[PDB]
DNA sequence: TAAAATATAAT
DNA sequence: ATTATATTTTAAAAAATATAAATTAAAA
DNA sequence: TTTTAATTTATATTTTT
């Protein structure tokens, strides 16, 4: 969603908590993998390498979001890696249109290597990035060995993610997309990372306090991120955010703002599919919630040595020191929550 | 509406050290029946109860019920201007966006005001309930606070064991497994050795140990810890001040 | 050769405590009048002169008017090696490009004897006008040091407001609006318990605080500083060397 | 089966305090003597050599000659729960790996009961023979920490030359050169400030200092610091723990 | 997927 | 006549490592 | 109260291949 979080900054920051990553501590939380998975393969490049073994196999994400659940162990929060499966047709296009933003990135590939400058070629190697059935069988084959439980979604796997954050399973979805938050998600993570504990901060959303400091509900959150810019469909040119905030606050539904809007001043688009994607936003193709269980298994250490070093020729001392310390971390106390025991009798603001 | 003048700066300094870091912005709300903060931390695991009553206060008035919310970092460095015989005068007006701290010197010489901003502050209060607790054990305050210490170099986590022969806080980590056993001392009973066992029931709960540690930096607040806990109920880390209120520390225990 | 005998050392390691995060290089000028140092920070803000007269030194004996380039960081670190009770001799031959402290024991048992080069450095001597002061307040530095540390706390701006009733320091930053009010004190003059302001006309001005904390630094050489300040002139941060010299802190408003 | 109980075990905490820095694994060799320690360096230059005999351990019972490795960063943390006055009784097993320590208060209700990890390690026996040293000193433990400290911030070695007025420290480098001399003293007291030196023959010795200043982290042991140095042979710092054992520190001369 | 910069545009 | 807004365009990590820095508890 | 002396802690390098 098209500047939703700049949003909700601007118009209501009591819904935003500046979290730390060790203050959790047995938290259970969803995860987007591939959007883990482009991270892990835009940031782990060193530069014109793209990470990978001497055999040419690519692997900088399968050790990048190892480490990173490994300290995701280490602070206590317990992940599910929930994948991206079939997207929904709305977004088949604009992704195809993605994907041509990409061709155009190869053409610009023979200003890259062609000239010789080396900067544009790290550039467009971050850019040429592209998730494979490779990659996803690679990081769920690396996730069956730690045992952290992973959800291949039938639908968009933010979805997936704010319907298991919806039956109460999960607390929390790990996405950094503000997807989640339309899709129906209570708490949403944003910037949830290993090392960087202070320069990118843990930021929660609420949806609750979104929709309680804003007068609004689920009807109208969906129909505010068509109009302020909706990944599935077209939004309306003549509206950005603010206009979105003084449009839905004042008029409810869809349907009674793309009735008395003009086509003069505001035009809406010739290839209207609010209501289809107001229904993809609203009931998704998402899986059964409690078909699945969540279980957190050890880690088998030897397998981890064999597939995570073995094919991918890395180190030993790292990784099984990062396997000792994933079973040292999950071995434990799970910790207990406060709102488990005192109920919240009320609320008390500055006034 | 809101005036109180307190005749030592030492009771002030020494709650906001203790809240300076375990919990960084708080919502104090501010009757005519006395000071109150039941604020609640980021991290999830752990409450203060604050009670600074109006008989403390030396002069107190209060026209109106009112809700200030400050950040605590910044009330801290704001409280540390301030000596430890220093005369605090918090006063807050009508539209109240300033709090006014006057720091008055015993020498009737140097007069400090601190116009400190505040911010838009919604923090919930959550419920507690007047409850008989199974352990009771009172503690000399440096005493815990060098338990908490001693036990934080060992693991990450406290097994408190209360019985009849006294209580017992467990550490197990990397370096090994310490237990400081402590008997209720009935021969002496003084004002500072003073570890008394009220005892209905043997509990044994598993706390984390960077809160106790964040929780004993109220440990110049008063010369007594009550740590009361039953079985399943969060423990209550209580700093009874002599003059007003109290400083109740409220932590979950870790369920196996 | 430059010879000079000082049996309580401790006021120099104050000294070079005091101008060690001011001063990176410094060019000490000695004469038969005694030590004097004339030079500007690294950040070319505040002004610093130290003046030591010659009385106060127990053997003082120079015969030209010699110039000390000194990094006194390392002036600092070897002066760290003396201690509250030593007696400091500083010694330069003719020669020698070389400064020897020399540390004898109050009871004479360990004889230190440092050896310090001396680097060669521009002449940062251009000289300061001398004023007659609106504003001089003769202030415990006890007090200053807790006003100018707290008030570092708020922002980087102390707003110093003189008149006759009281002197008024203020801070306005991003967490709160400090504002510190000190009156005339009638306990006879004491050493620590006197706060004595001389007037011409109420005055205002706006300093750093960065280097106000840095001149907080040179407080355990007295217990009474004087601030003086006029109208759009560099506030003076005086502190009175027990009876031996005087250290200046000239700092430009902002 | 192995008891060791110490009414103040303060030592026990200072001598993990003294060598938590220099060792970060050791071998306690226990026998029915007391403890000997025997290791080296974690970088293989300085070699410490621990004995507490059994008179001062106020209940001493061993049975069997263990050599146990303890991980002193550890055991430093483990004895840093300890008061200055806990009695510290050392309990162990001949069959578990634990090293147990019950730490009680002088009011009678604080008992902590800490174990430890151990370690089956073997370090190589490095006995160095006992010679008849030519130059020895005997001077406070502060006095040659403060040496090791302030000739610290000028260089890393010192050249040590001991003689018939006094023995002098001499440290050299960027910042310039020192010369500390201390000459001994007329019987002050017998371990209160009082530098005493035997002599056979003069003799210069030139150490590094980093490993020294890991060396006077054993000054609040004893009052006494007893260097003992010959020709071409490391330098031997000598702590006499309350006349119940030695921390000997060999160091090679570069 | 995200944010900023800056020319452009209308309330 | 700033306010919005949609254009262009950048950006995505986490290990240890050594090293400089700001607390905090220890030690006067 | 005031400094030291550690004691983490927030920067900032570098390969992690």
């Given at each position: 969603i098209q500047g939703l979080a700049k949003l909700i900054a601007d118009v209501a920051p009591s819904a935003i908590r500046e979290n730390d990553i060790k203050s959790y501590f047995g938290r259970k939380v969803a995860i987007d993998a591939s959007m883990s998975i482009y991270q892990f393969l835009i940031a782990v490049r060193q530069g014109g390498d793209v990470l990978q073994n001497e055999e040419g196999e690519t692997t900088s994400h399968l050790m990048g979001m190892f480490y990173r659940t490994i300290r995701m162990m280490e602070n206590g929060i317990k992940p599910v890696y929930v994948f991206d499966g079939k997207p929904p047709q709305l977004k088949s296009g604009e992704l195809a249109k993605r994907s041509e933003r990409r061709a155009e990135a190869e053409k610009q590939l023979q200003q890259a290597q062609a000239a010789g400058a080396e900067q544009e070629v790290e550039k467009f190697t971050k850019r040429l990035v592209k998730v494979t059935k490779q990659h996803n069988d690679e990081c769920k084959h690396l996730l069956s060995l730690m045992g952290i439980p992973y959800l291949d979604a039938p639908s968009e796997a933010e979805a997936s993610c704010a319907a298991l954050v919806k039956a109460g399973k999960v607390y929390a979805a790990a996405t950094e997309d503000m997807d989640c938050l339309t899709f129906g998600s209570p708490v949403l993570m944003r910037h949830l990372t290993a090392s960087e504990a202070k320069k990118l901060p843990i930021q929660e959303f609420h949806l609750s306090r979104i929709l309680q400091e804003l007068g609004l509900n689920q009807e109208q959150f969906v129909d505010l991120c068509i109009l302020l810019g909706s990944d599935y469909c077209e939004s309306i040119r003549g509206i950005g955010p603010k206009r979105a905030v003084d449009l839905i606050q004042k008029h409810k539904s869809i349907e009674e703002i793309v009735r008395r809007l003009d086509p003069n001043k505001?035009?809406?688009?010739?290839?209207?599919?609010?209501?289809?994607?107001?229904?993809?936003?609203?009931?998704?193709?998402?899986?059964?919630?409690?078909?699945?269980?969540?279980?957190?298994?050890?880690?088998?250490?030897?397998?981890?040595?064999?597939?995570?070093?073995?094919?991918?020729?890395?180190?030993?001392?790292?990784?099984?020191?990062?396997?000792?310390?994933?079973?040292?971390?999950?071995?434990?106390?799970?910790?207990?929550?406060?709102?488990?025991?005192?109920?919240?009798?009320?609320?008390?603001?500055?006034? | 509406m809101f005036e109180a003048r307190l005749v030592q700066g030492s009771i002030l300094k020494k709650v906001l050290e203790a809240l300076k870091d375990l919990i960084n912005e708080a919502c104090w709300d501010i009757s005519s029946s006395g000071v109150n903060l039941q604020s609640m931390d980021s991290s999830h695991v752990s409450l203060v109860q604050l009670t600074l009553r109006?008989?403390?206060?030396?002069?107190?008035?209060?026209?109106?019920?009112?809700?200030?919310?400050?950040?605590?970092?910044?009330?801290?460095?704001?409280?540390?201007?301030?000596?430890?015989?220093?005369?605090?005068?918090?006063?807050?007006?009508?539209?109240?966006?300033?709090?006014?701290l006057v720091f008055e010197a015993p020498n009737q010489e140097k007069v400090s005001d601190y116009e400190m901003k505040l911010m838009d502050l919604?923090?919930?209060?959550?419920?507690?309930?007047?409850?008989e607790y199974s352990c009771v054990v009172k503690m000399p305050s440096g005493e815990f606070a060098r338990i908490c210490r001693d036990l934080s170099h060992i693991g990450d986590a406290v097994v408190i064991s209360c019985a009849k022969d006294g209580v017992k806080f467990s550490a197990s980590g990397e370096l090994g497994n310490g237990n400081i056993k402590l008997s209720q001392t009935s021969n002496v009973d003084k004002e500072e050795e003073a570890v008394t066992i009220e005892m209905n029931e043997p509990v044994q709960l598993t706390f984390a140990l960077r809160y106790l540690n964040f929780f004993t930096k109220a440990t110049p607040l008063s010369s007594t810890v009550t740590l009361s806990m039953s079985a399943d109920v969060p423990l209550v880390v209580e700093y009874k001040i002599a003059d007003m209120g109290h400083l109740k520390y409220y932590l979950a225990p870790k369920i196996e």
């Open positions: 505001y035009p809406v688009p010739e290839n209207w599919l609010h209501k289809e994607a107001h229904q993809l936003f609203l009931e998704p193709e998402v899986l059964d919630p409690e078909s699945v269980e969540l279980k957190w298994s050890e880690p088998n250490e030897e397998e981890l040595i064999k597939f995570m070093c073995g094919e991918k020729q890395f180190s030993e001392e790292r990784i099984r020191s990062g396997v000792k310390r994933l079973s040292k971390s999950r071995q434990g106390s799970t910790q207990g929550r406060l709102d488990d025991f005192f109920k919240v009798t009320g609320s008390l603001s500055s006034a | 109006s008989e403390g206060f030396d002069t107190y008035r209060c026209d109106r019920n009112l809700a200030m919310g400050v950040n605590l970092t910044s009330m801290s460095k704001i409280l540390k201007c301030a000596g430890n015989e220093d005369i605090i005068t918090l006063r807050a007006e009508d539209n109240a966006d300033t709090l006014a919604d923090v919930e209060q959550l419920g507690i309930p007047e409850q």
